[PDB]
Amino acid sequence: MNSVTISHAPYTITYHDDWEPVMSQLVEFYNEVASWLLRDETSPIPDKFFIQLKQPLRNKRVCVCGIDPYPKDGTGVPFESPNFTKKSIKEIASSISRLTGVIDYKGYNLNIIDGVIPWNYYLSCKLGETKSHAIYWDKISKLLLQHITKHVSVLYCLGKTDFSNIRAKLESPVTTIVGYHPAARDHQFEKDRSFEIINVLLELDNKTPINWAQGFIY
Amino acid sequence: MDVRCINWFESHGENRFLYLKSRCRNGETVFIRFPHYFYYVVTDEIYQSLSPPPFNARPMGKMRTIDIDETISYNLDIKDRKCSVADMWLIEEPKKRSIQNATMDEFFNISWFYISNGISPDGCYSLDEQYLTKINNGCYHCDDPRNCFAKEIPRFDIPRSYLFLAIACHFDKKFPSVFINPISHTSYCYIDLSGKRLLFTLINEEMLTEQEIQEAVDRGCLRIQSLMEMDYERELVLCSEIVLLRIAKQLLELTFDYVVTFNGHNFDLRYITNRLELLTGEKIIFRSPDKKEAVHLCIYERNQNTTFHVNNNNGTIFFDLYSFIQKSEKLDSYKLDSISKNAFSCMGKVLNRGVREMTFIGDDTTDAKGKADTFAKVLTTGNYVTVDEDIICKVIRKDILENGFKVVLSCPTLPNDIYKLSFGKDDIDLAQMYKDYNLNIALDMARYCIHDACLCQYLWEYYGVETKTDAGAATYVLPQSMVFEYRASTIIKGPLLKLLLETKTILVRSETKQKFPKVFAPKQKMFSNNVLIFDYNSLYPNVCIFGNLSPETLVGVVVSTNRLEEEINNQLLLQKYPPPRYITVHCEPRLPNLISEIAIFDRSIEGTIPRLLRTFLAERARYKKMLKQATSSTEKAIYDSMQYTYKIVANSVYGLMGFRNSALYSYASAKSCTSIGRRMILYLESVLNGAELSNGMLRFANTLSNPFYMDDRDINPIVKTSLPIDYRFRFRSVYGDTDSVFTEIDSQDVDKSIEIAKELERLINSRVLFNNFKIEFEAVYKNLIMQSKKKYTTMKYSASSNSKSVPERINKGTSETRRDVSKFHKNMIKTYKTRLSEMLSEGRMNSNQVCIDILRSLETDLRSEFDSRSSPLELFMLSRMHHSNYKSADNPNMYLVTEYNKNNPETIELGERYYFAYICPANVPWTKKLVNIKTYETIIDRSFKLGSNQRIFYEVYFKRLTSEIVNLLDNKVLCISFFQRMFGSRPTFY
Amino acid sequence: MTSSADLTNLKELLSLYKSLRFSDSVAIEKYNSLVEWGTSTYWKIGVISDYYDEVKNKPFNIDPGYYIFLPVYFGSVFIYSKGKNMVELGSGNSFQIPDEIRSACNKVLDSDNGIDFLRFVLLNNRWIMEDAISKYQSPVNIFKLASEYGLNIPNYLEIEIEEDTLFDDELYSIMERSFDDTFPKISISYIKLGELKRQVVDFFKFSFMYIESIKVDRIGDNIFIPSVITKSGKKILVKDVDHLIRSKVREHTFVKVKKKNTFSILYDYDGNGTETRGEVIKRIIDTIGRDYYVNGKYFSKVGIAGLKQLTNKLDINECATVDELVDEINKSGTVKRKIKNQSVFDLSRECLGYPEADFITLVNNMRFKIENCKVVNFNIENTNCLNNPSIETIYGNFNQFVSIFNTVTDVKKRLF
DNA sequence: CCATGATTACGAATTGC
DNA sequence: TTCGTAATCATGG
């Protein structure tokens, strides 16, 4: 729960205590990447790049990740859509409603649930150019992901091609599950059953299952 | 219309095809596109029981399907193998289809394509124009490969185009990065279809303040401002970074044949692409021959360690020397300079002396035939030359003579006449040169970069990668680009499929295979007597042929858990399974409770693995014979490539039989091969140990009895020889493993040892051995000190060599490149190894005589060094790399680095490499017991002066020295006593 | 992984871990194999004393309510669970029961999934029911089903307590008299309605008493159990040979004995003596005689006899000569398959009742002389293995195992 | 009791500036 | 996948 100063924008990063023992190294990378980053307008704004850092890692068990953020109307919190217009979040909400049997709903937020963390591998992306910022973020993304993996219980990946060889990216052996594309053609995502294996392992890991219904918005 | 194939590649678009690249006699390039299908093998009933008809079906005939599952039996009542003979069909499907009871599912689609269409991957063919339809310029489409490729013509020579590249970036403290470090130099070697070898270098301008560029241009270089105004014929071009990257992208986009780079898939191409993208949004595009698919560069990884590959789809082969060298054969260090050391070498004579220079002459009358020509070829772009493998010299004047070379170098005078020359490390520090940049540095770095670029071509021609690629593509039935990317489990399916189709048999496994569960040491290390080396001629393939060990020729496995049933089973085994038709092999049990396991193999009908091995051996022998009778260099290279390919494919069978997920899994056959090999090795060791030559007759130590069953050969231990009468020698046996056997003769006459070794080889091959087991005399070793086949040093004389010949200094196991040991320990080990080699030849060494002398010398030298303190600090400096990728809490190195950062304005980053040493107070005396050494590590800076209140912790270095020396030598108790006297600790041997 | 097979397998492992039993070798092997598969495919995974509370031996006030009282007997305890074989405490091995009993137990178990396991009391080849543990069904409910299948059932008392009751000696005596069972009552286990915890009461007290000698009594087909006699002639029940050796009994000495209101039992030796088990094994054998061998927990004969076992083991009529024996085996129609599916060495071992591990160790240390598929001569190779006196006894009795083996091989050759 | 033996853990053997 | 050295703990002479 302190603050650090950076030469370039956003010029100030506020961090939680649990993020202390890696965040130092983070700055030494952001100094050699931000100069080329600010040339092109990107979503979200640079001030909102590191707003997910506030969520503590102690009371979280499940990690959900995406390869890229929302190209348009990004907010900083991954997989968040206040207007419920993104295809991925709509499909996720429909799948959750089908699994839980709830018919009436207005929206879903993954940040409301206590125990799961929404994360993005690449923390920034230019509007209209999907996955055009891998080179800038690669090392920072790897460092942050290996910090998350040391505290979560089970980690689930979205997208087969995006996370094809995610095991080699992380040195620490941790229970990992890789899923299919969130919006795969031929209704491939409709048959996905990762939300059950997740809490089967959670119970097997002597951890309380996740009450998914808390993520609903009414 | 006559075309020779070069490469076969695939397109991974929505509609997949297969592409063939070929060259005609004139030099034009022709691309042919085929449709790629999915191949399935089915039984006749399944073929007639398909509701949707397949796209096309071709009959295969009668095939016999055999279940090769292995079942453990505890009695001697064995059920016979169940085999089914039926008609089989081969069907093709444009898209993937699931078949309930398909067979032969462990073979690739490209192999099926090649075998069904009867096409060789590198054969020369006279195509037919009827079946080819033109779709673009240089790209045709074919639909009936069977008839278009029916005619075959003899091979004809074709031209080729090559590209070699080298990159030099900017760095001051750490490894270069795209974001802060620019590119300074690029070097290119270019070979077109006309046979003209161009060579150029591009230099950056951003570090060349205007007047300096004016002077450089006045010297003779060319300055360009736009991409279009560059000419390839001018050696040095001085331009900006953006233009440099544009030129690099344009060069990499051409339709070459080979782009060869040393570790360029990780650093060079990646850096070029990243920097080009960062500076300008313009990318690099690879296009398909039919102009239907466009891709961008993205180097991907394969785990086997990590190997990087390019995603091109235009037919060009992006080839990397690093991976090929790592997987082809094993060295000590895989650096470029070390490979150049071990590759380009020669012997030269000193023709002049005086001042600080020497004149060396090199000709075929000094070393061998062909070494001088290769050295002259390398010398064209060389700048530094290594002499005596110890000193480095700068070339001043070089003249290539008619059949040799002469070069003048700068080195101190040496009292000799014939020396050794090689190309290796360069005494150039790139870090200091970038601090004060100037034209002299720029030109010197350009020369170094162009030499680095040409080294790739020299190594490519030295290793013969082209011919090896062609031979592998032909033999393995695989595309050219896939030859050096797959392991043994993939390069074996082609010949196996061909043999299965010829034999008309299929092997099926209808269960799951459970995951069921030696180092040799020489009798002594120091010898001081001549050692004769014999090489077994493919021991495991011959064992497999002799025992007929194949999965489908295993009658059964009989096990027993007690001696009564074991004896009853043995009696019935000898009763109802008699030799020589059946062979019974004892093996180690696979379960903790079984006491006896016996495998039974039938030799009435030949198996599958023995047939493949015999075919490979016969082909290799034929190619050896054809090579020995060829005069053209191209034919010699082709035959050598073919024989090497056959060797490397025939030496992989033993590993593949014991691999769970292979196509030749046979666990009992694996045990049988190992057991028979061990029995043969032990029998030869027993018969050779003690055999002596008395008068003109020879005696062995045991009867020449067949070690498996009764045989009709003569079994008289006494044999009659033809050597001179006066010889009275005694022989000893020391070392023996699968691929070699060692013998010891007590003399120092190399010619006598060679002739007696030849006579022994003849007698052993003719009389002692049996069936297709034979040995070959390899070499004679002198001054042998060894710990294993991994670690040993000696001097080697070949079989075809006399006494007045240059020895071969064999030395391996040691690295001499481990940058975390010392600068002083290496020198001391070198000095004492030289002393050991020089003193072991005196004659009166025995066992407890050399150890005393070497220990006394070590004690005296160490005491003198400790009492003198004359060694400089730079000889005791160690290095490490700073990185925070550490587990645990402290890992004291991080604390030391942080303390140094706090207490010194100079900063050490998280990528820099820092030096450290062991510093203790100047008043502490010699200590025997030792404690945590991590406390005494101190960071040595550029301005660090060792004060009068400090000294170097010598005991650690001396302990490592004595440990490594004591790893050698024979006596153990003396070494223990010496080590306890010095440091009071127990050495860790082996 | 999208198919439901992996997740079904995962709940299968979850259930197995919830009901883990290290005794069953097959179950543990399957669990280890599936754990290896999971930890290799996913690179990592997260993976009857405790059913009984502290024992009560003093009077105390009880909470009023409804309780079920059952008698714990003095005998070897076995636990039977679905998907696993029979299990006895301590050793972790299994036993052999008739297939009809196993089928009845399976029919009892699969009816209600809440029954964790069933309790078996074994004492001198007699299997009886004592108690059961189920999270949903009371043991009284399944007692009727067990009795319906023909298996014996214990005496259960359903008592409703209204006021405070002290569980003193007199109340225990009243409960024992109300139970009225001839078999020994080693303890009383009571379960409260709606409570999953199991609580048991066993009063005990110690004294010192003399023993005249230790004998052994006949129980049946080569099964013997030691019998100790005292000065007063009253019999003290002993569990097995393991209990006898762990108690460190000594002949003609005063020993400490834990007594009930009806029977007194020897208790284990908790002293800090340096006595070694190995020499106690030979001393007790010498005192009882060299004609007995320790078949684990019991004693077995060494009698010659020889020919009067294949009839007994095969359950056929008596035999006189070889030819009529062959004919009697020939006319057999059902048991004959046992001859055609099971080996000869194992059949002879079963006929003479030797142990498995001990006999396997014995036959791996001596040499034979086999002729015409028959054994004629034998001798020892290493004499160290005869350190165990039982091995010496089997070595002495080997001259009859050889003959019965020869006869079985002869009849096997004659039949086919 | 403590010298000796055996585990554990660390990290280069790495390669291209 | 290897080897190699230090730091720690554990065990029988």
Please tell me whether residues C66 and C187 are part of one structural domain.
yes
- Give the C-alpha distances (Å, rounded to integers) separating A103 from A88, A99, A109, B352, C336: 19, 10, 17, 98, 67
Residue B238 and residue B378: Cα distance in Å, rounded?
A: 26
CB B349 within 8 A of CB B360: yes
How far is residue C3 CA from its own chain's centroid?
44
- Within 7 Å: CB of B896 and strand E? no
- Within 7 Å: CB of B812 and strand E? no
- By Cβ distance, the residue of C345, C370, C373 closest to B562 is C345
**CB half-sphere exposure, B94, CA atoms < 13 A:** 8
Across the interface, whether the CB atoms of B179 and A168 are under 8 A apart is answered: no
In-domain check, residue C10? no
Q: For residue A189, give both structure tokens.
A: 């995502």
- By Cβ distance, the residue of B75, B564, B572 closest to C363 is B564
Q: Which of B739, C34, B799, B915 is nearest to B906 (CA)?
A: B915
Please tell me whether residues B788 and B736 are part of one structural domain.
yes
Which CATH number covers residue B955?
1.10.132.60
* DSSP-assigned letters across all residues of B362-380: EETTTS-SSHHHHHHHHHT
End-to-end CA distance of chain C: 55
Pairing of strands B72-73, C86-88: unpaired
Q: Which of A18, A40, A47, A68 is catalytic?
A: A68
Under DSSP, the state recorded for B54 is P
Best mutation target among B173, B179, B296, B299 (most A Cβ atoms within 10 Å) is: B179
Please tell me whether residues C323 and C405 are part of one structural domain.
yes
For chain B positions 613-672, those within 8 Å of chain A (CB to CB) are: none
CB-based contacts of A7, cutoff 8 Å, min separation 6: A31, A34
Please tell me whether residues C251 and C337 are part of one structural domain.
no
CB-based contacts of C370, cutoff 8 Å, min separation 6: B564, B567, B568, B571, C376
Closest alpha carbon to C1' of D15, residue: B335
Please tell me whether residues B945 and B909 are part of one structural domain.
yes
Residue B591 and residue B596: Cα distance in Å, rounded?
A: 10
Question: Which residues of C are less than 8 Å from B565 in CB distance?
Answer: 343, 345
Choose one of B158, B174, B191: the last residue of a domain: B158
Q: List the beta strands (DSSP E) in C275-371.
A: 293-294, 299-300, 366-371
Please tell me whether residues C165 and C277 are part of one structural domain.
no
Across the interface, whether the CB atoms of B884 and A25 are under 8 A apart is answered: yes
CB B463 within 8 A of CB B324: yes
Residue C187 and residue C196: Cα distance in Å, rounded?
A: 19
Domain count, chain C: 3
Choose one of B422, B442, B475: the last residue of a domain: B422
- By Cβ distance, the residue of C3, C14, C43 closest to A200 is C14
Which CATH number covers residue B314?
3.30.420.10
CB B307 within 8 A of CB B301: yes
Radius of gyration of chain C measured on its C-alpha atoms: 26
Structure determined by: cryo-EM
| Single-letter amino acid, residue C163 | E
Under DSSP, the state recorded for B79 is P
Name the β-bridge partners of B394.
Answer: B384
**CB half-sphere exposure, B19, CA atoms < 13 A:** 24
Bond into A209 cis (ω within 30): no
Count of C-beta atoms within a 10 Å radius of residue A126:
16
In-domain check, residue C52? no
In-domain check, residue B564? no
Examine the residue annotation and report whether A68 is marked as an active-site residue of this protein.
yes
Task: Spell out a b/e string for C334-353, using b for 16 or more CB atoms within 10 Å of the CB, else e.
Answer: eeeeebeeeebbebbbebbe
Nucleotide nearest to B892 (CA to C1'): D10
Across the interface, whether the CB atoms of B572 and C373 are under 8 A apart is answered: yes
Q: Show the CA angle centred on residue C166, arms to residues C160 and C169, nearest 5°.
A: 110
In-domain check, residue B476? no
CB B666 within 8 A of CB B657: yes
Name the β-bridge partners of B607.
Answer: none
Please tell me whether residues C119 and C161 are part of one structural domain.
yes
Which residue range(s) make up the domain with B949?
Answer: 824-982
- Give the C-alpha distances (Å, rounded to integers) separating C258 from B549, B851, C183, C189, C272: 69, 73, 18, 19, 20
Choose one of C201, C231, C257: the last residue of a domain: C201
Residue C270 and residue B251: Cα distance in Å, rounded?
A: 90
In-domain check, residue B549? no
Q: For residue B317, give both structure tokens.
A: 């082969």
In-domain check, residue B647? yes
Q: Show the CA angle centred on residue C69, arms to residues C64 and C72, nearest 5°.
A: 140
Please tell me whether residues B681 and B642 are part of one structural domain.
no
In-domain check, residue B848? yes
Which residue range(s) make up the domain with C351?
Answer: 310-415
- Within 7 Å: CB of B307 and strand E? no
In-domain check, residue C186? yes
- A7 to chain B, any CB pair closer than 8 A? The answer is no
Distance, Å, B891 CA → E3 C1' = 22
Q: Which of B85, B117, B73 is nearest to C343 (CA)?
A: B73
Please tell me whether residues C186 and C219 are part of one structural domain.
no
Across the interface, whether the CB atoms of B564 and C360 are under 8 A apart is answered: no
Residue C69 and residue C75: Cα distance in Å, rounded?
A: 19
Please tell me whether residues B128 and B177 are part of one structural domain.
no
Please tell me whether residues B150 and B170 are part of one structural domain.
no
CB pairs under 8 A between A and B: 20
| Chain B span 745-784 residues with beta carbon within 7 Å of strand E | none
Choose one of C201, C233, C268: the last residue of a domain: C201
CB B601 within 8 A of CB B555: yes
Name the β-bridge partners of B124.
Answer: B4, B153
| Single-letter amino acid, residue C55 | V
- Give the C-alpha distances (Å, rounded to integers) separating B393 from B357, B446, C386: 9, 19, 80
CA distance B179 to chain A (A): 6
CB B476 within 8 A of CB B74: no
Q: Which of B29, B37, B291, B65 is nearest to B145 (CA)?
A: B37
Nucleotide nearest to B791 (CA to C1'): E3
Choose one of B134, B158, B182: the last residue of a domain: B158
* DSSP-assigned letters across all residues of B696-737: TEEE-SS----SSS---S---SEEE--S-TT--EEEEEEEE-
Across the interface, whether the CB atoms of A32 and B909 are under 8 A apart is answered: no
Please tell me whether residues B192 and B324 are part of one structural domain.
yes
Domain count, chain B: 6
Helix (H) or strand (E) holding A110: none
Which CATH number covers residue C283?
2.40.50
Q: Which of B612, B623, B606 is nearest to B498 (CA)?
A: B612
Question: Which residues of A are less than 8 Å from B277 in CB distance?
Answer: 135
Which of helix, strand or coil describes residue B862?
Answer: helix
Please tell me whether residues B104 and B171 are part of one structural domain.
no
Which of helix, strand or coil describes residue B58?
Answer: strand
Across the interface, whether the CB atoms of A174 and C6 are under 8 A apart is answered: no
Chain B, nearest residue to C376 by Cα: B564
Bond into B717 cis (ω within 30): no
Residue C375 and residue C400: Cα distance in Å, rounded?
A: 12
Residue B190 and residue B201: Cα distance in Å, rounded?
A: 11
Radius of gyration of chain B measured on its C-alpha atoms: 33
B921 burial (CB, 10 Å; 0-12 / 13-18 / 19+) is exposed
Residues shown for chain C = 416
- In B, what residues contact C, Cβ < 8 A? 74-75, 561-565, 567-568, 571-572, 595
Q: Show the CA angle centred on residue C362, arms to residues C358 and C368, nearest 5°.
A: 155
Distance, Å, B731 CA → D11 C1' = 46
Across the interface, whether the CB atoms of B562 and C360 are under 8 A apart is answered: yes
Please tell me whether residues C253 and C187 are part of one structural domain.
no
Q: For residue B314, give both structure tokens.
A: 């235009």
Which of helix, strand or coil describes residue B979?
Answer: helix
Which residue matches tokens 């390869």? Answer: A67
Residue C297 and residue C225: Cα distance in Å, rounded?
A: 8
How far is residue B714 CA from its own chain's centroid?
44
Count of C-beta atoms within a 10 Å radius of residue C358:
17
Please tell me whether residues C106 and C127 are part of one structural domain.
yes
Which residue range(s) make up the domain with A161?
Answer: 3-218
Question: Which residues of B are less than 8 Å from C360 in CB distance?
Answer: 561-562
Residue A137 and residue A139: Cα distance in Å, rounded?
A: 6
Which of helix, strand or coil describes residue A172?
Answer: coil
Please tell me whether residues C188 and C231 are part of one structural domain.
no
Which of helix, strand or coil describes residue B320?
Answer: strand
Best mutation target among A29, A133, A135, A138 (most B Cβ atoms within 10 Å) is: A135
Residue C47 and residue C25: Cα distance in Å, rounded?
A: 18
Residue A152 and residue A143: Cα distance in Å, rounded?
A: 15
CB-based contacts of B597, cutoff 8 Å, min separation 6: B557, B558, B559, B586, B587, B588, B589, B590, B671
CB B689 within 8 A of CB B732: yes
Residue B17 and residue B94: Cα distance in Å, rounded?
A: 11
Please tell me whether residues C220 and C137 are part of one structural domain.
no
Name the β-bridge partners of B921.
Answer: B950
Residues shown for chain A = 218
Task: For B688, list phi and psi in degrees, rounded to 5.
Answer: -85, -30
Helix (H) or strand (E) holding B775: strand B775-786
Across the interface, whether the CB atoms of B572 and C368 are under 8 A apart is answered: no
Distance, Å, B988 CA → E6 C1' = 13
- A40 to chain B, any CB pair closer than 8 A? The answer is no
Chain A, nearest residue to C12 by Cα: A200
CB B859 within 8 A of CB B865: no
Under DSSP, the state recorded for B265 is I
